[PDB]
């Protein structure tokens, strides 16, 4: 029968330590071809992207697929779109106490699916996060700035913390529009690092 779950809307049990096990809800996003166990969700209430093995983590429970998969919506504004994928941004949040708050951050691409939301990283947090930028851009807090042989997918990554271990990981995606750019997921953690391999940022971080 069918087994692709990418567009399909999910439920499921999610036990975070030894807490009571609460409901979450979310989109699938994609499904990554160098690891078919791992899953990228959108949840609702939740800005960063999860990468999930839906069908093995422990934390998981009584997960559910709906059939009636979400359709992508007609594109109107990829002249606007194609003038932020791959550009350096500011990005302008309220903050609880009072107003402002600007955080430098880099455009990746249009999100799969959901395809009213782009994919988006920050200086001050290096991971993946997904929101309407275009609706965003018109109420005027986002500024777009100007600009001034074998295959890294698949490979395995890791590198040394400060207290002497060693972070492990596999490298499951290129960013088209920049394509010094990777996502990286590490075994440890659910959200999706992001590294600009030309930055010292990314120097300490090493392959096999």
């Given at each position: 029968?069918?087994?692709?779950?990418?567009?399909?809307?999910?439920?499921?049990?999610?036990?975070?330590?030894?807490?009571?096990?609460?409901?979450?809800?979310?989109?699938?996003?994609?499904?990554?071809?160098?690891?078919?166990?791992?899953?990228?969700?959108?949840?609702?209430?939740?800005?960063?992207?999860?990468?999930?093995?839906?069908?093995?983590?422990?934390?998981?429970?009584?997960?559910?697929?709906?059939?009636?998969?979400?359709?992508?919506?007609?594109?109107?504004?990829?002249?606007?779109?194609?003038?932020?994928?791959?550009?350096a941004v500011e990005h302008m949040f309220e903050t609880e106490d009072g107003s402002k708050?600007?955080?430098?951050?880099?455009?990746?691409?249009?999100?799969?699916?959901?395809?009213?939301?782009?994919?988006?990283?920050?200086?001050?947090?290096?991971?993946?996060?997904?929101?309407?930028?275009?609706?965003?851009?018109?109420?005027?807090?986002?500024?777009?700035?100007?600009?001034?042989?074998?295959?890294?997918?698949?490979?395995?990554?890791?590198?040394?913390?400060?207290?002497?271990?060693?972070?492990?990981?596999?490298?499951?995606?290129?960013?088209?529009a920049k394509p010094s750019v990777y996502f990286i997921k590490f075994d440890d953690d659910?959200?999706?690092?992001?590294?600009?391999?030309?930055?010292?940022?990314?120097?300490?971080?090493?392959?096999?």
């Amino acid at each position: 029968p069918r087994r692709n779950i990418v567009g399909c809307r999910i439920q499921h049990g999610w036990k975070e330590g030894n807490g009571p096990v609460t409901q979450w809800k979310g989109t699938v996003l994609d499904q990554v071809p160098v690891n078919p166990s791992l899953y990228l969700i959108k949840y609702d209430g939740f800005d960063c992207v999860y990468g999930l093995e839906l069908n093995k983590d422990e934390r998981v429970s009584a997960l559910e697929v709906l059939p009636d998969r979400v359709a992508t919506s007609r594109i109107s504004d990829a002249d606007d779109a194609d003038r932020m994928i791959g550009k350096a941004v500011e990005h302008m949040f309220e903050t609880e106490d009072g107003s402002k708050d600007e955080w430098r951050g880099m455009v990746l691409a249009r999100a799969p699916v959901m395809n009213t939301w782009f994919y988006i990283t920050y200086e001050k947090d290096p991971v993946l996060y997904m929101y309407q930028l275009l609706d965003d851009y018109k109420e005027g807090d986002l500024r777009i700035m100007p600009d001034s042989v074998d295959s890294l997918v698949g490979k395995q990554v890791e590198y040394a913390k400060e207290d002497g271990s060693k972070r492990t990981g596999m490298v499951i995606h290129q960013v088209e529009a920049k394509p010094s750019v990777y996502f990286i997921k590490f075994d440890d953690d659910f959200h999706i690092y992001v590294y600009d391999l030309v930055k010292t940022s990314a120097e300490n971080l090493y392959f096999q």
